[PDB]
Design a protein around this ligand. Structure first.
Ligand SMILES: [Ca+2]
Lengths: 129, 132, 133
């Protein structure tokens, strides 16, 4: 009976804790409530094929790790000193009901963008199954 | 009912030559089996609009060509992203209208710093938008 | 069926103003994108994904901006300020829920607006309908 879409952002000037789940606290759109800004996790309601993608701004080293149901799927790292860059990553996943997806950082955890540079995490259902 | 999507990473630990097809050997997702991990090429069976995208980890200068075409490939765009004595992640994307038999893939250049490993992955993905 | 979807690149962009114009069309199904203005126009109401990957060598800060009833809606931005004269790709993207007539475009920061011009490599702006309504 349904669709699935979200874009959430991190609105804080403080970076995540090292080796932790990245919480996106602000919503740009999240009609089904699949992303939970309280836990930082997306949970599958409608099973099928999803795209997940993020673009995270940072002024020191940052690796982003995408987890699915407790397994690291992909990791992408950008190194910088002082100046600002965007770390991006993404993947397509066929999920079953109740599966959780989330982003984390490792020992490289910086998400402090300069003024005007934000961090965003999006996902959407492409093919119901 | 055309559900076509693929995501494959590159774990191949071997330098790339100019004009060589960049193979993404490890399949995460391959609905409809239109991606070939053996070649690194997507082959269209269902004509339509597709989106392709990639994220490439790198330790130096990288330029990749996004290739389209049936038997003879043609470059659509080239994405370059440089890095000096550091580590980077770069990305590119394209919505393409595909005809039957057309392949899409990424092709290396002289600028070939690309990594494929756990904790610094390089991935190539694509999916059908609308068939027709 | 509605199949709105486009990609455009920079080749001979008209320069002036803060809207980044992607003058060369690669894909434009249902022709929602106007290559002379750099603007995507919504015909089909629904949820859309827009993304960009734009090349700089100095400082760039870019935002995906929209309008509804002609009123501009500013949004998040994405910057690369490496500023060393070597190629860097700044990217960003987001789902937007749009009504008929809404427009969507990429704008640069008047103080950080270096976008590479030449034949070596490309910058791209893409968008597509995820679902109607
Ligand atoms: Ca770079």
């Amino acid at each position: 009976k349904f669709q699935s879409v979200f874009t959430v952002t991190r609105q804080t000037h403080q970076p995540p804790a090292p080796n932790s789940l990245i919480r996106f606290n602000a919503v740009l759109t999240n009609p089904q409530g699949d992303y939970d800004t309280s836990t930082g996790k997306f949970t599958c309601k409608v099973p099928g094929l999803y795209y997940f993608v993020y673009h995270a701004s940072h002024t020191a080293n940052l690796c982003v790790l995408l987890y699915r149901s407790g397994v690291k799927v992909v990791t992408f790292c950008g190194h910088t000193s002082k100046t600002n860059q965007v770390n991006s990553g993404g993947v397509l996943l066929r999920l079953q009901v109740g599966e959780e997806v989330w982003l984390a950082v490792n020992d490289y955890y910086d998400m402090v963008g300069i003024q005007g540079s934000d961090s965003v995490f999006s996902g959407f259902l492409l093919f119901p199954d | 009912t055309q559900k076509i999507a693929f995501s494959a990473t590159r774990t191949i630990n071997v330098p790339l030559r100019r004009d060589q097809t960049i193979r993404f050997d490890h399949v995460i997702t391959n609905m409809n089996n239109n991606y070939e991990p053996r070649s690194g090429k997507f082959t269209c069976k269902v004509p339509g609009l597709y989106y392709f995208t990639y994220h490439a980890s790198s330790r130096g200068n990288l330029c990749v060509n996004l290739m389209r075409g049936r038997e003879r490939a043609q470059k659509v765009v080239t994405f370059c992203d440089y890095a000096y004595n550091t580590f980077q992640v770069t990305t590119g994307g394209m919505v393409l209208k595909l005809e039957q038999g057309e392949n899409v893939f990424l092709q290396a250049t002289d600028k070939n710093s690309l990594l494929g490993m756990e904790g610094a992955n390089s991935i190539f993905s694509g999916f059908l938008l609308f068939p027709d | 069926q509605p199949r709105p979807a486009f990609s455009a690149i920079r080749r001979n962009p008209p320069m002036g103003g803060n809207v980044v114009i992607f003058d060369t069309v690669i894909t434009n199904q249902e022709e929602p994108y106007q290559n002379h203005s750099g603007r995507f126009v919504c015909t089909v109401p629904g949820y859309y994904y827009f993304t960009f990957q734009v090349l700089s060598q100095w400082e760039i800060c870019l935002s995906i901006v929209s309008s509804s009833r002609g009123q501009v809606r500013r949004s998040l931005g994405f910057c690369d300020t490496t500023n060393k004269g070597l190629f860097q790709v700044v990217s960003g993207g987001m789902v937007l829920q749009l009504q008929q007539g809404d427009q969507v475009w990429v704008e640069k920061d008047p103080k950080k607006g270096h976008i590479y011009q030449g034949s070596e490599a490309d910058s791209v702006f893409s968008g597509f309908l995820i679902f109607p309504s």
